[PDB]
Amino acid sequence: GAPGAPGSQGAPGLQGAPGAPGSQGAPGLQGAPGAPGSQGAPGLQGAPG
Amino acid sequence: GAPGAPGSQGAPGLQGAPGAPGSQGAPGLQGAPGAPGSQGAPGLQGAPG
User: Fold this and answer.
1) Adjacent-strand bridge partners of B24
2) Quick one: closest CA in A to B34, which residue?
């Protein structure tokens, strides 16, 4: 018998992993599908004179 | 050790642009302006005197 001096790596099976999932489906607004840039523009377009 | 442990697995990539739907524009107007009437004086001085 003698001091086993087995050493060890108590660091767990957790394995760190500082890397987020990555926001795979989270691109802000998945690309902001918000309103159209415009929907009209012909102004003062009447007729009679 | 961690023989293949994909520890901290994140996101191999990204990318996609925001919704910028149709921006309508400005049609003209004034089909056939011609303020409806008989241009000039239909009639030749109506038998003067």
Assistant:
1) A39
2) A49
Q: Measure the CA angle with vertex A45, ends A39 and A46; round to 5°.
A: 135
- CA–CA separation, A18 and A9 (whole Å): 19
**Cα–Cα distance for residue pair B41/A41, rounded to 1 Å:** 39
Angle, CA A24 vertex, CA B7 and CA A19 arms, to 5°: 25
Whether A46 and B35 have beta carbons less than 8 Å apart is answered as no
Declared resolution, Å: 9.8
CA A14 to the chain's CA centroid? 24
C-beta atoms of B11 and A32 within 8 A: no
- Identify any residues that bridge with A39 across adjacent strands, giving them in sequence order: B24
